[PDB]
Amino acid sequence: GKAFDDGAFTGIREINLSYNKETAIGDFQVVYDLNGSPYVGQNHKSFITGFTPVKISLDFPSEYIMEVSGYTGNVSGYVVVRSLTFKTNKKTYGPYGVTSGTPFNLPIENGLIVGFKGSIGYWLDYFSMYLSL
Amino acid sequence: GKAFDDGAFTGIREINLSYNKETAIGDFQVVYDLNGSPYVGQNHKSFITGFTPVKISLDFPSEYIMEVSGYTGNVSGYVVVRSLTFKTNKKTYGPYGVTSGTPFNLPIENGLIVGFKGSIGYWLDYFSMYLSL
Amino acid sequence: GKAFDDGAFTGIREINLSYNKETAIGDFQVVYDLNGSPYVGQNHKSFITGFTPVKISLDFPSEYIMEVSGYTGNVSGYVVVRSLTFKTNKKTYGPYGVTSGTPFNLPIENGLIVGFKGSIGYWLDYFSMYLSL
């Protein structure tokens, strides 16, 4: 649908996404840290609506994501990210969405996620992460 | 003087500084690139006036700085940055200010200057540079 | 098993591993690049015999790994890495092992794998990868 690329920042302060239990992940938006200050990322929205919004407020800078995981599977003819899970050094947020399909997981032993890129049509088709020290 | 720290970015698009040949560097401001977008950095102003304005507009991203050099020395009893010169892969900008005092130079073989921090009172007292691939 | 950590290098020239089609990955060894010179990494041996050896000789530096995928699952009661596939910009090496269980994949959009660490008992219990630009 619409490709997006936030690029790289200094860290992550908040993740705002939406999902629907009948389908998959819908909107995705990140509030990044940029050199000590909040930078409000572009909101990447689904072309459709009716999703449930959730806010993940991290206690930046002490709390940081250590693992991202979820599921990819078919939804009315498209293979998209149906579920997302974010585990920080402090706690786990999610699963959000539907945990059906094939799983994927990105555990990080050293470094930080500093940006997100991907594509969203009706749902989140795919995404990539920027990693840095 | 008053300390400043712009932090790190994706690159540099323009540098706006001022200087006075009798004294030293005065104002310093940078338009950085933030993931493809110009980022207007704050204008770190000298406490006094009478400076000559200089705008260095780089042909980003084709053009980038390859060496920053200059001179440090005493003006009215303060050890400050009396002069600056910015050499890119295309042109040399400067010197701005009198080339007297202790020289210094930072040639870059691989990598990019991606931020500036320092302190400015009546003149630029000191500065450091963020470097990155 | 015995934990190992090769550390980080400049790149990868060859990978020598062994696997068993009914169990999991066994031996694992890597000849890295250390600033232009091949670096023969220590051979990390399985405590048991019975594996089929595999030599993956990359055309360094033009050829490099773009994705590492595989499968994890229990073998004799141990959660181990059962299968591995290395995809470079020139070809695919694998799958080696048993393609069943929980899949995992690490696609690299930008950057390089520059080191391996993990643990090997009867089989490769787990592994992690150093990434760099």
Partner: peptide, 16 residues
């Protein structure tokens, strides 16, 4: 070299 800073990127997950 580019005048653009680069960083490690992993993925994508969700189909290529």
């Amino acid at each position: 070299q580019s005048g653009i800073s680069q960083t490690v990127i992993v993925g994508p997950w969700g189909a290529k």
